């Protein structure tokens, strides 16, 4: 009949709630050098510990779209690279006239660079000398309204004076572990057919979420996890078609890209302690950079992505085109190949039809043919908003590989037409968040509420 | 069990293993001041239950009765139907919604009885 | 009564309502490193206190007796000129001289108590 | 005696003007970013100390003897060649492997012990 | 300029050594060797501490 009310502390009870979280990062980093990179200068050691804990039962649910873990990343990664470009030289005196010699060819189907010729300061604020660098075409514009072949000047002087980046200073994607702060916890749905929302039924908790990439890619994501089943369409919609749909590869498609021209630096000084690095010459003889992908692996691929993504347009087609042109900042697949920012056509890979039936690997002419893409090159980079935009990148001499995996899609998607199937998919991408999004589907942030109230037949001794 | 692990699991297996909670209100070394005003913030929030536990008496650690009675109509429940098969996650949604009283109840209460630890003390 | 609505009643009445006070030392979100710094000073300020009130064994919230008596030349008053007129506000001001003495003999005497707690326990 | 004049001294003399050294974890106005963060390191080393000490029932400040055994393997002396000669500071270099298991014992033990004292008043 | 662009120091601001004294925070403690044959290494025999260096 009597019962007296009893207060509990620490018990296990949460809400999800918002916080800032810190870095994390493994141990092997940390022999490197100050500025070089981020994951050693402005992150915590820390083995990924305590290990992971599943929980018995949990009645749980879900978001993905609104996660707010990824806009914390966003602003750590934009907030950390304008520090991190703090400390380089912004060029500026290289808004002087470029005169660049009028070269011609018959169609050589090989880019050929504008070799260029300008002035520069030399160890005395007053005498002057000239100079010679060659330089890529698209950051390179042509100066007169007139119709003049003879003087160009850098892209850039017209929105801001880019910074180079200092080559001390790497740009790989170690892996960064993101890790809640006391009194809180991250829970991970654990279930392997999870979708993007809605409730989860397997979760466990981890104090600090394991291996993200910031690897930057528009249209092919780079280097990222694999799903342990079906390869998961997710959406945040689909009645509204502009919402950008996600792609999650099964297996991976090895995707090899080279720059085989044997360019090599060249040290241009600009004004006191400090210099500026261009291309020097060319050795060797000049070809067409590149990316090369399994024919039959990427054939198999994107069929199975058709046989997972007809479901939620079942009577229709699973047909394939190019993306919808437009800015080649945008239509292009971009990244960077461990210097040097690729920027690819895809038109060669996303050209095809589905008609529901699975197919096997054979017949097969060779297996070690593939299918090529050609890729141009830049220096003066524009990609994100806010954070001082144009960054100069400097030359590396030699020449460069990066072979890599592919392991996720960004799509979009037209609208109806005739009543009729051939509604067609197109790559598309620029918003990061969808880049990041793609690896925290898994996460989600909770504060613990440790007091709690109940009832007991127990009154207080007074 | 740990940190969580006790969650879902039944009120009266949760009522056990309390000091695995309360020992987890540290971490962290700090770069930037979002660390540090993560540290803060986590000793703040720390010493704002510390410190009200602390209004009713409890400094018992964290088991603690008072001498509040329970009003029915708050759930409306039988001992064993509370506390037997219920978990105490869903329990706190449940009854999220009373707090304020309880909390002034037991303030209240204790504010009241401390005097009487003098009074049944100045007899001699 | 709030935070000082009892400032200037009697000491009875002050007597009560100091719950109101101790539940008041939380307060702000930070612009800049000066609000940072006015946390970090209210936390480290209030556990001066706290840490304080702890070593003279008033671990019993906040009234507490203590065995130390009263040097009648502090004051030179009965019960009654102390407590049934006076405000707490003014007798802060007036007792504000000799309070080292005071906290000195607080901090021996219960040094010196808290043994025998052992002593007459080890008996079995 | 102050802050470690009682140091080398024997463990007998050494457990008065514990209270002393309890006091001493206040200091320091600020420059730069680095005082800050001793400040807020300070607090947080304190209150682990203060939070840990509480978990094992020691709620009556700093000396608190407990239901725990001494297993004699451990030092494997008799109480006089424990106390009457030897100092703390080489005490805790002698004790100092042991400590995980004397720590999880005095959680455990007052863990369990807790609910004996809803059980011896539930009976009312 | 064959290294860097040099900076004025301001003759406001001067260059005198003014002593520093160095203070360990809370939790903390500096002992020190107040022995007067101390050569740089080993165990010494006669200890002090102070707050403040
Ligand atoms: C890219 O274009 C730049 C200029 O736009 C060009 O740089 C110039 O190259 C020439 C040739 O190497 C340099 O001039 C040489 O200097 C040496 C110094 O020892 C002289 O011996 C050379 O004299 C011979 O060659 C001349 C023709 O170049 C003859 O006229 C002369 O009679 C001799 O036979 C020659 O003068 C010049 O200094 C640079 N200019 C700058 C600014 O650096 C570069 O070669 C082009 N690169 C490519 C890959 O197209
Ligand atoms: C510069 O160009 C040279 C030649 O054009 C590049 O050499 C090639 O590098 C690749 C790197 O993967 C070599 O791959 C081989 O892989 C097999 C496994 O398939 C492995 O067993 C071999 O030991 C080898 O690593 C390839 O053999 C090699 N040569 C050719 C003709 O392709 C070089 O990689 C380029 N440098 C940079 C920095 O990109």
């Given amino acids: 009949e009597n019962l007296w ?74 907030s950390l690279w304008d520090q991190s470009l703090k400390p380089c030289v912004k060029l ?127 249209q092919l994501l780079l280097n990222g996890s694999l799903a342990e089943k079906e390869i998961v369409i997710r959406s945040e919609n689909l009645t509204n078609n ?11 498609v090895e995707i090899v890209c080279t720059r085989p ?29 590149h990316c090369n992908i399994s024919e039959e692996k990427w054939n198999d691929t994107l069929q199975k992505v058709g046989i997972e993504l007809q479901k939620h347009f079942p009577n229709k087609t699973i047909k394939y085109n190019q993306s919808a042109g437009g800015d080649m900042e945008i239509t292009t697949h971009s990244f960077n190949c461990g210097g040097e920012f690729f920027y690819c056509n895809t038109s060669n890979l996303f050209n095809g039809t589905y008609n529901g039936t699975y197919i096997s690997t054979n017949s097969s002419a060779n297996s070690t043919s593939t299918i090529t893409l050609q890729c141009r090159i830049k220096q003066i980079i524009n990609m994100w908003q806010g954070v001082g935009r144009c960054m100069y990148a400097p030359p590396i001499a030699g020449n460069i590989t990066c072979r890599s995996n592919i392991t996720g899609l960004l799509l979009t998607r037209d609208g109806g037409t005739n009543s009729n199937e051939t509604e067609t998919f197109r790559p598309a991408g620029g918003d990061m968040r969808d880049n990041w999004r793609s690896e925290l589907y898994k996460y989600k942030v909770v504060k613990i509420e440790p007091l709690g109230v109940a009832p007991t037949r127990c009154k207080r001794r007074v | 069990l740990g940190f969580l692990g006790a969650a879902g699991s039944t009120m009266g297996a949760a009522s056990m293993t309390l000091t695995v909670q309360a020992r987890n209100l540290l971490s962290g070394t700090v770069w930037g001041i979002k660390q540090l005003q993560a540290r803060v913030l986590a000793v703040e929030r720390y010493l704002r239950d510390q410190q009200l536990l602390g209004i009713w008496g409890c400094s018992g ?63 001699d």
């Fill in chain 1, 261 to 289: 021209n044997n360019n090599t630096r060249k040290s241009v000084r600009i004004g006191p302690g400090q210099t500026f690095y261009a291309t020097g010459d060319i050795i060797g003889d000049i070809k067409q950079a």
């Fill in chain 1, 5 to 78: 009310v009893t207060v509990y502390y620490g018990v296990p009870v949460w809400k999800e709630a918002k916080t800032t979280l810190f870095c994390a990062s493994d141990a092997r980093a940390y022999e490197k050098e100050v500025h070089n990179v981020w994951a050693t200068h402005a992150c915590v050691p820390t083995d990924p510990s305590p290990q992971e804990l599943v929980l018995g039962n949990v009645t749980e649910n879900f978001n993905m779209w609104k996660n707010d873990m990824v806009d914390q990343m966003h602003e750590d990664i934009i």
């Fill in chain 1, 92 to 218: 500026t005196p290289l808004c002087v006239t470029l005169i660049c010699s009028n070269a011609t060819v018959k169609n050589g189907t090989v880019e050929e660079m504008k070799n260029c010729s300008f002035n520069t300061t030399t160890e005395i604020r007053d005498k002057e000398k000239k100079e010679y660098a060659l330089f890529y075409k698209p950051d390179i514009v042509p100066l007169s309204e007139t119709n003049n072949t003879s003087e160009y000047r850098l892209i850039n002087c017209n929105t801001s004076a880019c910074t180079q980046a200092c080559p001390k200073v790497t740009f790989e994607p170690i892996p960064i572990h993101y890790c809640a702060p006391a009194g809180y916890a991250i829970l991970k749905c654990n279930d392997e057919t999870f979708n993007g929302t809605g409730p989860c039924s397997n979760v466990s908790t981890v104090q600090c979420t394991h291996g993200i990439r910031p690897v930057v890619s528009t």
């Fill in chain 2, 61 to 123: 650690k964290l088991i603690c009765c008072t001498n509040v009675p329970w009003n029915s109509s708050w759930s409306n429940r039988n001992l064993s139907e509370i506390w037997d098969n219920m978990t105490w996650l869903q329990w706190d949604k449940e009854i999220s919604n009373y707090t304020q009283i309880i909390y002034g109840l037991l303030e209240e209460s204790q504010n009241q009885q401390e005097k009487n630890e003098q009074d049944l003390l100045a007899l």
């Fill in chain 1, 242 to 252: 502009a919402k950008i749909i996600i792609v999650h590869l099964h297996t991976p």
